[PDB]
Design a protein around this ligand. Structure first.
Ligand SMILES: CCCCCCCC/C=C/CCCCCCCC(=O)O[C@@H](COC(=O)CCCCCCCCCCCCCCC)COP(=O)([O-])OCC[N+](C)(C)C
Ligand SMILES: CCCCCCCC/C=C/CCCCCCCC(=O)O[C@@H](COC(=O)CCCCCCCCCCCCCCC)COP(=O)([O-])OCC[N+](C)(C)C
Ligand SMILES: CCCCCCCC/C=C\CCCCCCCC(=O)O[C@@H](COC(=O)CCCCCCCCCCCCCCC)COP(=O)([O-])OCC[N+](C)(C)C
Ligand SMILES: CCCCCCCC/C=C\CCCCCCCC(=O)O[C@@H](COC(=O)CCCCCCCCCCCCCCC)COP(=O)([O-])OCC[N+](C)(C)C
Ligand SMILES: CCCCCCCC/C=C\CCCCCCCC(=O)O[C@@H](COC(=O)CCCCCCCCCCCCCCC)COP(=O)([O-])OCC[N+](C)(C)C
Ligand SMILES: CCCCCCCC/C=C\CCCCCCCC(=O)O[C@@H](COC(=O)CCCCCCCCCCCCCCC)COP(=O)([O-])OCC[N+](C)(C)C
Ligand SMILES: CCCCCCCC/C=C\CCCCCCCC(=O)O[C@@H](COC(=O)CCCCCCCCCCCCCCC)COP(=O)([O-])OCC[N+](C)(C)C
Ligand SMILES: CCCCCCCC/C=C\CCCCCCCC(=O)O[C@@H](COC(=O)CCCCCCCCCCCCCCC)COP(=O)([O-])OCC[N+](C)(C)C
Ligand SMILES: CC(C)CCC[C@@H](C)[C@H]1CC[C@@H]2[C@H]3CC=C4C[C@H](OC(=O)CCC(=O)O)CC[C@]4(C)[C@@H]3CC[C@@]21C
Ligand SMILES: CC(C)CCC[C@@H](C)[C@H]1CC[C@@H]2[C@H]3CC=C4C[C@H](OC(=O)CCC(=O)O)CC[C@]4(C)[C@@H]3CC[C@@]21C
Ligand SMILES: CC(C)CCC[C@@H](C)[C@H]1CC[C@@H]2[C@H]3CC=C4C[C@H](OC(=O)CCC(=O)O)CC[C@]4(C)[C@@H]3CC[C@@]21C
Ligand SMILES: CC(C)CCC[C@@H](C)[C@H]1CC[C@@H]2[C@H]3CC=C4C[C@H](OC(=O)CCC(=O)O)CC[C@]4(C)[C@@H]3CC[C@@]21C
Ligand SMILES: CC(C)CCC[C@@H](C)[C@H]1CC[C@@H]2[C@H]3CC=C4C[C@H](OC(=O)CCC(=O)O)CC[C@]4(C)[C@@H]3CC[C@@]21C
Ligand SMILES: O=c1c(-c2ccc(O)cc2)coc2cc(O)cc(O)c12
Ligand SMILES: [Ca+2]
Ligand SMILES: [Zn+2]
Lengths: 612, 612
């Protein structure tokens, strides 16, 4: 916005000041004879500051003018130690520019005059940001690795580059290559930089050194969805046991992958990333066999056991609403439109028989069970929802909004029972619907979990809610029309639209065709009704048929074209929740440990397969 | 389960005890220097057993080490006569391991030291099981044939390996090649092992030796759907008569294919197996014209006659239920909600007029026709498939269950008629519905109805069982809400939810939109009715749209491309059933008997075809 306008004016007044200054211009235009005349005129203003604090060496390096960049050196050798001074390109020297532009003959002549290989481009354009378009690090050795130039990397380290150097984000030169868009070229540069880590006394192998978020180069490849570097780093963690003809028993490490409770694991960090490429890591041969192992053995059976206890809680709540205390009414019927026969009992007369004491036991099971919902989930939606992730699990999305809304409605029914307020049917009727609609979500884990089952259910609900916005204006147009047509008529003969909230609810029902069209045949209806309702019935039929076709066309686009899994991240983030809630004695750790088989303290997973 | 927990701990215990013992380690690492050290120290415990009861010679053959394996054999040659004595790898010798690993120079080393080529590896990890990735037999000829090694098969026969050795479930080496995943490589090995059957004095040749289930290799390729080896084994059963340009008159054997009437044939095995590529053999040439021969000539006439006799029998049963004996009621009505006017007559009253004697003939035809159902179908589910194929063949046809359940309901109605019990309308109502829905069975015998009935009848138990559970959750949740909203109201105006079972039935009907939404308009309905029913109608719309989208994917797309294949497989199961039940005087045996043409007592089918 205001900042994007600021970058654009900054680049235009850069080119404006390179044209209105001759030594900046000849460095750009590679006018080698124009340098000799101006520099012999008593070295005029060789300490230039252009738009981005640039000197004339920065211009000559930027446009790959090797012949013009030489003349600046013998004229004043103090320009090779000069950075750019603006906020956007802060700290960038000429050695950074020639490395990114891959100018071989220039970068030797810079090192020939002792250019610092440990400079730090701290500017706002050299920071990881979606507004920035490249993130190449902060060091010249980091710039050489990202543009894929093997010969510069061998040249820079020879002059003393530090491969252990880190950024302001803590990323070393091996963290940055995982962030690069071309994966295959970054895979060759990874093997190169590890070969120069001879260094057996640095107390840490360099591909274990964490950034300021604690992530290793292994975990960062799992978070950023870099599947090419993930499979490359996994051969460091395999161990082939035997090969019996076509069979092979491979043993995987599972130290930085499986959860230990005290530390965030790779399975959790894929979920909170919310990226589309990070879910491809869940398809990989150590991780894919781990998720299906614990969602077959502990994760799924405990999911169905918690849903069976919730079903007994809602049945116990349902019985207390059916047998709610009611007495015949005390006052007389006011209007002839008053249908009410019964009313609620007061608190003193609610409990005076032994059959009410059986109900009182059931009413206390409900309230105690409603507090437990608040005591375990008011932490959860703070932890889960706004901090890490929301709506990408099974039992997920509008489950946690609704079951919190359930337990709120039960405690409202308790208050209205105590102060003997009228209208407890209103918090109960919400709580029956809210409570039983949550049972449909536990029914989602009774499935074999295909790749396009839960996301299609989530999709169809998403299109129906978009259809309800477009049909609200169609109802409001025709309900207002139907209201003023029958506004001069007698509602004893046709009372579908007798006041305006009823006319709105009738037109909603006629749209879905769940009540019949109004007709009497013993009296003359207005003529404007018949042509309006014939227009309404054609519109409502076509809009309901186009809804079905639009759900078919949107189903095809997300199965055949969007090509996103969604089905492994749902069973991961469900299994993470049940593992933090249950104690350790009910949850054995997946894999098998060492010290009785002699491999360490590490929890290995054996995978046996057939090559064919 | 705990089976993989016990299996994975032994593979780590194996690698542990290799790492513990110096003799097992240096043989594993092919460190033959320590092999000479540990033998000249002492003739030690060189008959020690690790995890899976193995020796140092088993390890050296497992990890493909020529040099380490030799040193064990000159030191102590008695290790070659040693099987693994655990339960997982019981019976396996080092000769088995070298063959599977295809270490050809090690095979010469063992056979020069007279390694027994008839050892039977009868372990747990060698049986045919869905938990095993391999089923290679129990013999070294069987192990060599399944890894596609010609030079080892030639080497083992020359050293006296029995080519007709059998597993402990019956299979010879010719059976095992059909059970292999690579069909093309098995065909070359099949031709090779018959080229060593020169020594025929054995009454059954190798391609005519049954296993413990009676199946030959030709029938086993039929059951397993091995269409590659089926066509190759059909070349042995052909007989080409003449070639007249592009024409060819091939004569087929039909001994193991056609129903012999004593043994289960090839047609009977393919129908009674739960496989899909086995059904593809119904399009192979000698079977395809055999099936069309039986149906066009004797199957379709006997099926249309049986469909016409059943149709008249149900019309006779229908008129006996319409004219069932009823008299006016004796007592007076109790409540004004009592709607009953008539009740049943008794046996003394039900047969007094000549119209009752006409009905008595029709009732006896009904009872006799239900006993004949229980005599041709009940001694078919007790001898053949005692309780198993009574449930196993239901995927082929559910109409066995419906016609037996019909035949009981007629006899339940008979017993109640004799003891004058009340409530004959309950067993009749099941019998009328089950009587007329069994007419839909005979729709398969028509080309106009057959393929279209396949698409209509095809319902999916993965999504409709999901729909029935979620429908029941909405109905129990919203009928409970609708019950307590109208619990205080007058039910003579709106009586849809007057007690709780009717509210369950009204909400069921409103979900399917088969009764109108409740409305009076002459009285004030409660406010929570409009909120709940609008929420209910959007949920009921969504669950229908979830059901249509579920019916448009990956199963109905499969049936829409396979309905001609699925209909021609119902023709086979109908024809095979009719050929068993009808006597041999009404069903002539197919093909042409070659007794009067000099061909043996075999029944030949003649097929003329154009190669062009
Ligand atoms: C009847 C009308 C009144 C209701 C109006 C308000 C209702 C909402 C309407 C809002 C406006 C209409 C727009 C459609 C909905 C959002 C768009 C969307 O993405 O759809 C998503 C629906 O949502 C889900 O099923 C997943 C859960 C995430 C969202 C949380 C819902 C809020 C809970 C409160 C809910 C109400 C309970 C409040 C009362 C207690 C799914 O779309 P998708 O992308 O195809 O799915 C792929 C999943 N993926 C994204 C992970 C890849
Ligand atoms: C999430 C997807 C769905 C979208 C949600 C919204 C869906 C729609 C939900 C609607 C909820 C209810 C809204 C109106 C309720 C007022 C009724 C009332 O009190 O009537 C009173 C009158 O006063 C009126 O009639 C005022 C209504 C006129 C304007 C309608 C409001 C526009 C909705 C804003 C949003 C629309 C935009 C949404 C689309 C962009 C009483 O009238 P009476 O008793 O008949 O007597 C009159 C006296 N007389 C006899 C002299 C005549
Ligand atoms: C696993 C799920 C699969 C599905 C299987 C489901 C399982 C089986 C499901 C249901 C069981 C069988 C049906 C129940 C019928 C009750 C008996 C009856 O007919 O009513 C009789 C009495 O009954 C009452 O009055 C009940 C009063 C409220 C009881 C609340 C539950 C108490 C449970 C305690 C804790 C539970 C622990 C739960 C938490 C762990 C007759 O009553 P009335 O004379 O007609 O009316 C007057 C009553 N009034 C005076 C109060 C108004
Ligand atoms: C004691 C507490 C329980 C503890 C149990 C401990 C062990 C539990 C362990 C495992 C439990 C589950 C194992 C069953 C086998 C899996 C098959 C399956 O999932 O069906 C199908 C899903 O369809 C469904 O949605 C559900 C089908 C079953 C009906 C309802 C189940 C019970 C509901 C409540 C009744 C009362 C039960 C609760 C009582 C209150 C499979 O679908 P699909 O074929 O993959 O379709 C893919 C098609 N596509 C590829 C095109 C997309
Ligand atoms: C191919 C498909 C199309 C062709 C289908 C056939 C053609 C169309 C089908 C039917 C024709 C149309 C209706 C029938 C005649 C009209 C009604 C009538 O006159 O009946 C009269 C009574 O008569 C009776 O009581 C009927 C007895 C019922 C059982 C019939 C036994 C048949 C015996 C043969 C066994 C067959 C062996 C089966 C072999 C497997 C009516 O008299 P009423 O005034 O109503 O008084 C009733 C008093 N009562 C209640 C005391 C009785
Ligand atoms: C009393 C006399 C009645 C008739 C006799 C009894 C009927 C028998 C009729 C036919 C025999 C069997 C039919 C299925 C064919 C073989 C499958 C099988 O055997 O297993 C089935 C057992 O079946 C059941 O458990 C009950 C069926 C429930 C149907 C629910 C919807 C229909 C409702 C309509 C009526 C509404 C009721 C409302 C009325 C109040 C289910 O197993 P599966 O799902 O195939 O296995 C899962 C693996 N899969 C996912 C890969 C597929
Ligand atoms: C109803 C009266 C009762 C009388 C009882 C007395 C017993 C005897 C009664 C009939 C004897 C039938 C056997 C002989 C004829 C069959 C063989 C045949 O020729 O094939 C014919 C088809 O078949 C037919 O069109 C005839 C069907 C007869 C009625 C059967 C009703 C089925 C009832 C079940 C309801 C099912 C629906 C269920 C849906 C829910 C046609 O053959 P084609 O292909 O044209 O041949 C090529 C000829 N061409 C070369 C010249 C072209
Ligand atoms: C698919 C489900 C299919 C069948 C399942 C249910 C079969 C029928 C149940 C009705 C029982 C009955 O006869 O009611 C009796 C008692 O009234 C009650 O007991 C009310 C509670 C019903 C039982 C528990 C339901 C909870 C969910 C089910 C738990 C298992 C399901 C779990 C999840 C699948 C009769 O009382 P009434 O007639 O209401 O008296 C009204 C008096 N009045 C007229 C003055 C107002
Ligand atoms: C004034 C009226 C419109 C009441 C307003 C409340 C409704 C807008 C919301 C509240 C929560 C309900 C929901 C309750 C649970 C269901 C199941 C559904 O998830 C499933 O399990 C079905 C599969 C699928 O989503 O397609 C998602 C939302 C739905 C239909 C409901 C959508 C609409 C409801 C009635
Ligand atoms: C599903 C598509 C076709 C429409 C989606 C719009 C709904 C989200 C809204 C707008 C129309 C409905 C409304 C229509 C009018 C009624 C009036 C109602 O108040 C009364 O019933 C008073 C009746 C009287 O005074 O006689 C409150 C909300 C309600 C049920 C509805 C609430 C929600 C609905 C379902
Ligand atoms: C006196 C008794 C009858 C009280 C009711 C039983 C409660 C002790 C339990 C069983 C039903 C509830 C559960 C209902 C559902 C949730 C979700 C949870 O599953 C997940 O964490 C995954 C959610 C997701 O992946 O989106 C399992 C337990 C929890 C919080 C609840 C924990 C405790 C509750 C209140
Ligand atoms: C006294 C007389 C006039 C009554 C006539 C009796 C027939 C109406 C019934 C009695 C027993 C027979 C039935 C008995 C069993 C068979 C197999 C068939 O069983 C199946 O459903 C096959 C299922 C499958 O293959 O998938 C159903 C009807 C049929 C041909 C028969 C149809 C008609 C028959 C001759
Ligand atoms: C359990 C899941 C896997 C499938 C369940 C679906 C159906 C088998 C159920 C759903 C709700 C229905 C029931 C809902 C309530 C009714 C009441 C009915 O009659 C009464 O009890 C009294 C009615 C009256 O008062 O007149 C008996 C069964 C019925 C139709 C239904 C029987 C079967 C239905 C279709
Ligand atoms: O059920 C249908 C049908 C339908 C289904 C089967 C038929 O035989 C006819 C119409 C058409 O459009 C819809 C459109 C919808 O929005 C919702 C629906 O449930 C349907
Ligand atoms: Ca109607
Ligand atoms: Zn497409």
């Amino acid at each position: 916005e205001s900042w994007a306008q600021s970058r654009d004016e900054q680049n235009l007044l850069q080119q404006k000041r390179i044209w209105e200054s001759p030594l900046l211009l000849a460095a750009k235009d590679n006018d080698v004879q124009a340098l000799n005349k101006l520099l012999k005129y008593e070295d005029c203003k060789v300490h230039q500051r252009g738009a981005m604090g640039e000197t004339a060496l920065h211009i000559a390096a930027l446009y790959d003018n090797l012949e013009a960049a030489m003349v600046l050196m013998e004229a004043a050798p103090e320009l090779v130690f000069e950075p750019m001074t603006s906020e956007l390109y802060e700290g960038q020297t000429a050695l950074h520019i020639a490395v990114v532009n891959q100018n071989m003959n220039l970068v030797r002549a810079l090192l020939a005059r002792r250019a610092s290989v440990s400079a730090r481009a701290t500017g706002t354009a050299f920071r990881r940001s979606p507004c920035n378009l490249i993130y190449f690090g902060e060091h010249p050795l980091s710039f050489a690795a990202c543009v894929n130039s093997e010969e510069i990397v061998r040249l820079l380290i020879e002059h003393g580059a530090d491969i252990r150097a880190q950024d302001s984000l803590g990323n070393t030169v091996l963290h940055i290559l995982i962030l690069q868009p071309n994966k295959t070229f970054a895979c060759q540069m990874y093997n190169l930089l590890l070969s120069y880590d001879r260094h057996g006394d640095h107390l840490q192998p360099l591909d274990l050194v964490p950034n300021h978020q604690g992530l290793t180069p292994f975990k960062l490849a799992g978070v950023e969805g870099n599947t090419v570097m993930f499979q490359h780093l996994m051969q460091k963690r395999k161990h082939t046991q035997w090969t019996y003809g076509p069979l092979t028993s491979t043993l995987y490490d599972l130290t930085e992958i499986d959860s230990s409770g005290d530390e965030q694991s790779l399975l959790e960090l894929i979920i909170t990333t919310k990226k589309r490429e990070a879910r491809q890591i869940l398809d990989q041969t150590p991780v894919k066999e781990l998720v299906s192992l614990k969602w077959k053995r502990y994760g799924r059976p405990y999911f169905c056991m918690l849903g069976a206890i919730y079903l007994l809680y809602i049945i116990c709540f349902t019985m207390c609403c059916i047998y709610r205390p009611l007495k015949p009414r005390t006052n007389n019927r006011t209007s002839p439109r008053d249908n009410t026969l019964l009313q609620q009992k007061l608190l003193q007369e609610a409990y005076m028989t032994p059959k009410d004491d059986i109900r009182l036991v059931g009413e206390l099971v409900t309230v105690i069970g409603a507090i437990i919902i608040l005591l375990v989930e008011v932490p959860d939606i703070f932890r889960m929802g706004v901090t890490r992730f929301f709506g990408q699990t099974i039992l997920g999305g509008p489950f946690h909004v609704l079951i919190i809304t359930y337990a709120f409605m039960v405690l409202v029914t308790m208050v209205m029972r105590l102060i003997s307020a009228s209208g407890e049917v209103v918090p109960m009727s919400f709580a029956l619907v809210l409570g039983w609609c949550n049972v449909m979500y536990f029914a989602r884990g009774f499935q074999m979990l295909g790749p396009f089952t839960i996301m299609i259910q989530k999709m169809i609900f998403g299109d129906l809610m978009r259809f309800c916005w477009l049909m609200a204006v169609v109802i409001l147009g025709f309900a207002s029309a139907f209201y003023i047509i029958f506004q001069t008529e007698d509602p004893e003969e046709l009372g579908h639209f007798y006041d305006y909230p009823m006319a709105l609810f009738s037109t909603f029902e006629l749209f879905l065709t769940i009540i019949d069209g109004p007709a009497n045949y013993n009296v003359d209806l207005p003529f404007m009704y018949s042509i309006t309702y014939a227009a309404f019935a054609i519109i409502a039929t076509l809009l309901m048929l186009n809804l079905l076709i639009a759900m078919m066309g949107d189903t095809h686009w997300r199965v055949a074209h969007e090509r996103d899994e969604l089905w492994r991240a749902q069973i991961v983030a469900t299994t993470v929740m049940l593992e933090r809630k249950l104690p350790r004695c009910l949850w054995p750790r997946s894999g098998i440990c060492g010290r009785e088989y002699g491999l360490g303290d590490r929890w290995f997973l054996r995978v046996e397969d057939r090559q064919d």
